[PDB]
C-alpha cells in the first residue's frame, strides 16, 4: 500500500506541474487552476491519512481539469464533495 | 487498465519534458516539433488501445527529449510508428 | 523495491524525469536556490548511475531526497550530506 501512496504523490506532482504549464500557455483560466489547486490540497491530505479512494478521485478530477475536459462548476462541485468525503 | 493509465501519465510527463528542454536550449525546435507529432500518434494509440504503438512512441519521445536520438532518426521513427498504427 | 527489473528501472527513470522538471519549476518561481538545485542534480547523477546498475534502493533513496528538496522540505546542508552518503552507499 506504500507503493500506491507513492504513485499518488507522483501523479500529484505531475498534475500540479501540468496545471501550471497549461495556465502559462493560456489554455486554462486562473479560477479553474485555483479550484483545481484546492482539490490538490485535498489529495495531499488524502494521501497523508491513507484515503486512497479520495486521493484517486481527486487526481482524476485534476487531470480532467488540466486537459480542459471538465468545467469550473464541475471542479467546484467535486471539491466540495471530496472535502466532505475526506471528513468521513 | 493500469497500462492505459501509465501510458497517459508518461505522455503528460514527456509533453512537459519536451517543452522544458526546448526552453533551456537543449533541444532544437525541429526535433521538438517532430517529437510532438509522435506524441499525437501516442495520444491516438492510447485512445485506440494500441498499447505497443503507444509504448514505443513514448520511448522515442523520451530518447528525443534526452538528446539521445538524432533528428533524422526521430523522423524515421515517426514514419515507422505512424504506419504501425494503421 | 520490486527488484531491478526493466519495469522498475523504467519507473525510477520516470520519477527522475518528473523531479528534473519539478526542480526547474521551483527554481524558476524562486522556491529553490541555485546551489540547492546543483546539489540535487548531483544526487540525480548518482540516481542515474544507480538505475543503470540495478541499484534500485540507492536510486529510490536519491529520488526521495531530491523530492523532499524540491518541495522545500530539507535544507541545503541536508542535501549535501545526503549526496555524500548516497555516493558512498553506491
Ligand atoms: Zn498515475
Ligand atoms: Zn493527463
Ligand atoms: Zn513510464
Ligand atoms: Zn526520460
Ligand atoms: Zn515513483
Ligand atoms: Zn513530490
Residue of C1, C12, C21, C56 to mutate when probing chain A, most A C-beta within 10 A: C21
The distance from CA A80 to its chain's CA centroid, rounded to whole angstroms, is 12
Q: Residue C46 in contact with residue C86, Cβ under 8 Å?
A: yes
* Residue ranges with CB less than 5 Å from ion ligand 5: A 10; C 15
Among all ligands shown, which has an atom nearest to the Cα of A12? 6
Distant-in-sequence, close-in-space partners of A31: CB < 8 Å, separation ≥ 6:
A72
Give the A:C interface size as CB pairs under 8 Å: 14
Distant-in-sequence, close-in-space partners of C76: CB < 8 Å, separation ≥ 6:
C33, C35, C36, C39
DSSP C11-67: HHHHHHHHHHHHHHHHHHTTSS-HHHHHHHHHHHHHHHHHHHHT-HHHHHHHHHHHH
Q: Which of C25, C39, C89 is nearest to C60 (CA)?
A: C89
Q: Which of B7, B2, B19 is nearest to B44 (CA)?
A: B7
In angstroms, the Cα distances linking C20 to A5, A71, B59, C78 are: 21, 31, 18, 19
**Strand, helix or coil at B20?**
helix
Q: How was this structure determined?
A: X-ray
**Burial of residue B83 (number of CB atoms within 10 Å: 0-12, 13-18, 19+):** exposed
What's the grid cell of residue A32? 479553474
**Domain edges within chain C:** 6-89
The four Cα atoms B66, C2, A47, C66 give a dihedral, to 10 degrees, of -40
Residue of A18, A25, A65 to mutate when probing chain B, most B C-beta within 10 A: A18
Measured CA to CA, the distance from residue A62 to residue A58 in angstroms comes to 6
Alpha helices for B1-86 (secondary structure H): 2-23, 29-47, 51-65, 71-85
CB nearest to C15's CB, from A10, A17, A20: A10
Measured CA to CA, the distance from residue B55 to residue C5 in angstroms comes to 17
- The experimental resolution of this structure, in angstroms, equals 2.2
Q: Residue C89 in contact with residue C58, Cβ under 8 Å?
A: yes
Distant-in-sequence, close-in-space partners of C28: CB < 8 Å, separation ≥ 6:
none
Amino acid at each position: 500500500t506504500e507503493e500506491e501512496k507513492h504513485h499518488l504523490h507522483d501523479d500529484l506532482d505531475l498534475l500540479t506541474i501540468l496545471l501550471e504549464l497549461n495556465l502559462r500557455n493560456g489554455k486554462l483560466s486562473k479560477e479553474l487552476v485555483e479550484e483545481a489547486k484546492r482539490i490538490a490540497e485535498i489529495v495531499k491530505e488524502a494521501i497523508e491519512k491513507g484515503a486512497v479512494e479520495v486521493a484517486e478521485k481527486g487526481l482524476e478530477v485534476i487531470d480532467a481539469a488540466a486537459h480542459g475536459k471538465i468545467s469550473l462548476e464541475e471542479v467546484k462541485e467535486a471539491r466540495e464533495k471530496l472535502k466532505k468525503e475526506l471528513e468521513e
